[PDB]
Structure formats: C-alpha cells, structure tokens
Design a protein around this ligand. Structure first.
Ligand SMILES: [Mg+2]
Ligand SMILES: [Mg+2]
Ligand SMILES: [Mg+2]
Ligand SMILES: [Mg+2]
Lengths: 10, 236, 236, 10
C-alpha cells in the first residue's frame, strides 16, 4: 500500500 | 509548437477525447498547446492540464522505480555482473522523466503563475510547481539535489500561505496541497514528524468546517480527508 | 535504425527490462532493433517481439474503438454538431495504428518469414502476419479492405496448413493460431459458422491429445483450450 | 466480456 498524493493515476 | 496551428477550443476538445481514450501523452501535448496560446486557464482546463501530465509522469515514475530496484539488486554482494544495460536504461527513462518535469515547470513559469491572480488558480499552479520539483527530487543525486528540494519546499510554502489566508479548510485544492506537502516532508525532506503534524492538523480543521458544506462539497472534501487519514494510519 | 549502434544482446536484455517496467513502446523499439541485426530469432526472442508489439497496438486499438464510438454517436439523428475534432483525432490514432502494423509486417517481410525454416518459427511469423493484417482490416473502409482481409486469410491459411502437418494438436502456437483465425472468421470475414466450427474442432482434437502431455505442457494447452471454450460460449 | 485472441495485453 503506497501513501497517497493527488491527483492519482487513472 | 506543433499545436500552434490548432484552435485553442479544438485543443481543449481533443484533450477531453484523449482522456476518454486513455491517451495521456496526446492529452498532455494538447494541453501544452492550449497553454501556449497565452490565455489564462479556466478551472476545468487546469484540471485537464494536471490530470494529463500526472498520468504521463506517473507511468515514468513507476518504470523508474522498477529499474532502480533491479539496478540496486545487481549492486549487491554476490550479485552476478550483467554489464551496463540496467544503468543505461534507468538513465534513459530518468532523462525522459526530467524532460517532462522541466516542460511542466516551463509552462508554470511562462507564464501561468505570474498571470494567476485568484487564490484558487495561483494555489493550484504553485502546488503543481512543488509537485514537479518533488518528482525531480525523487531521482536527484548530485549537487543540485538540495536546491531542487528547496525549490519544492519554497513553492509548497507559498501555496500554503495563500491557501490559509484565502480558502476554507475544506477546499479540495487546499486539502490536496496539504496531502502532497505532507508526503514531501515524509519521504523527500526527511521530516516524518512535520509530515504527521501537517496531516493531522489539516484533517482536524477540515472536520470542523464540514458542517458548512453541501452534500456534494462534503463528498469532495471527505474523499481527500480519507487519503490524509490513510497516510497517517501508514505512518503511525 | 537508432538501435543500429547497440549490441543485439543489450537490445534483448533491455527489451526484458522494458517489459518489467511496462514500457512497451521501448520494448518494441528494442525488439525492432534486434530483428534488424539480421540474425534469426530464438523462441524466447520471438515471444518478446510479439508481446511488445501486441501491447503497443492493443493500446491503439482500445483508443481507436473509444473514438470511433464517440464519432458514431455524433452522427446520430438529433445529435448536436461539434465540428471535425472527433474525426480528426480518430484519424490521427488510426494512422499511428496503421504505421505500427506496417512496421511489424515490414519486419516479417524483411526478412523473418523467408529465413524461418522450422515449423514453430514459420507458423509463429505467419500467425503474426495474419494478426497485423487483421488489425489493419479492423479500421479499413476503402477499396483495399477486401485485399487486406484476403492478405490476413492467406497468411492464416498457410500457417494452418503447416501447423496441421508439423505440430501436435495441443501445441500452444497451433491453438493460439486457431483461436485468432476463428475470431477473424467471426468478426472480420462475416463467417460465424466457420468461426464456431474451427474452434470446436480445434478444442476436440486437443482434448484427445492431452494424455500425451506432461503436467506443464498440460497447463499451457488447457489454458488456451479455455479461451476457445469461452469464445464458443459467447457465440452459441 | 470481449472474445479472446492471443497474446493478450498486460
Ligand atoms: Mg499545429
Ligand atoms: Mg515523535
Ligand atoms: Mg543505436
Ligand atoms: Mg448454424
């Protein structure tokens, strides 16, 4: 599970 | 500018077709051409620009991390030498990634940021600037790695100062900025405590502002607050 | 040939790195360069060539079908005119798709098919030729659409004649050829009955040969027989 | 559900 950043890939 | 011959409106219409076709290289070239017409971008057009380049650079970052991992394994003790091919191909992908980052930073610099007067547009572009200096920082190893990191922090900080004075704590661009700035603290700047503090503070202040929102605004904001909470669950 | 300067072995090593990185454009360019060294391809190298171009052209076919569907909707009765952008962009993607198909057909013609003496290599290349004439046929609308279809049928038929004389009915290339030739009958040649008959006959003869196979050969063949059975379930 | 051909995309 990778930490989140915005925006995300398709 | 191979797009200099196409109508701005046709470039925007084809960026949307390219998104539905999942043709993100085309989508980015179209939005690059639209920006180079020299008019400011609408809210929707800013999202198309951002969505297009994020998918392009996201494919390159994923590939860079696979090749960098294979390259590190081949530098182990008891690893069998295979020659320069892993390093050469990781360098090629990395150079292509740096070109996309430089293309985007060139668009923000010529001249999107200096014409962006509204909080929402200026915060959006300064966030983008921090993000693309961050992607360059992910692969930097030389003298300028410190300068690249400070270029990202500096753009992130200015966006944060504006968004704090000019936007509600639930504004999706403000929450997206804080999410990304937080991750920069965690994995780029070696500041995991600063990363956690910003994510908790951003989450708490938005929670307190949710009561002012309509059901659709509430769905937009809560979606991003859940990403903040996921990062915090991963880091604590 | 921008790959003419790289070692054949480095081109093959980088095609495998590109596959793991999911960089199929790079993978195809590398395998294109390997073919242009003029040596025959090993079994593994043929798979890399095929896998690389199938992913490239597969991304283009998916995009072509989305744009072609949007274009047909805009040609309805009561559809609101939006101008030439949908048709222009569908044409661009289509032209790019035809170039990839022509690149592959050029490699098989210069000179992979004429040097392929073994059943397994020659059937493999003749299948590829049928497949890429088939992709051209999917977008053809002019005078040469009939000629393109016959070019696909002709290459498919010659591969089928060889594979019937020279390979067991469970051979994975033979089953893959029959699967693809069957779908050509169904959706290109307007021969749904021929499509069903070939798939049933291919499935039945392989079933009768399974007892000769090792556990790994058995897994390879049964995997492809399941795709034949799925198509038959969809068409009957 | 699309009919099958080989090889398949990633
Ligand atoms: Mg132009
Ligand atoms: Mg602590
Ligand atoms: Mg070269
Ligand atoms: Mg019948």
């Amino acid at each position: 599970p990778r930490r989140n950043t915005l925006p995300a890939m398709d | 500018g191979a797009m200099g011959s196409m109508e701005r409106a046709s470039l925007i219409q084809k960026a949307k077709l390219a998104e539905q076709a999942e043709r993100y290289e085309d989508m980015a070239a179209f939005m690059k051409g639209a920006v180079e017409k020299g008019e400011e971008l609408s809210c929707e057009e800013r999202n198309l620009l951002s969505v297009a380049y994020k998918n392009v650079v996201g494919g390159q970052r994923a590939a860079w991390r696979v090749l960098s991992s294979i390259e590190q394994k081949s530098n182990e003790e008891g690893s069998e030498e295979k020659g320069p091919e892993v390093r050469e191909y990781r360098e090629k992908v990395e150079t292509e990634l740096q070109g996309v980052c430089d293309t985007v930073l060139g668009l923000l610099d010529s001249h999107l940021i200096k014409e962006a007067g509204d909080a929402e547009s200026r915060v959006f572009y300064l966030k983008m600037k921090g993000d693309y200096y961050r992607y360059l920082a992910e692969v930097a190893t030389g003298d300028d790695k410190k300068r690249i990191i400070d270029s990202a922090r500096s753009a992130y900080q200015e966006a944060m100062d504006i968004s704090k004075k000019e936007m509600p704590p639930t504004n999706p661009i403000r929450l997206g900025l804080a999410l990304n700035f937080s991750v920069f603290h965690y994995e780029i700047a070696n500041s995991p405590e600063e990363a956690i503090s910003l994510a908790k503070t951003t989450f708490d202040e938005a929670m307190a502002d949710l009561h002012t929102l309509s059901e659709d605004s509430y769905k937009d904001s809560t979606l991003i607050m859940q990403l903040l909470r996921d990062n915090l669950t991963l880091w604590t």
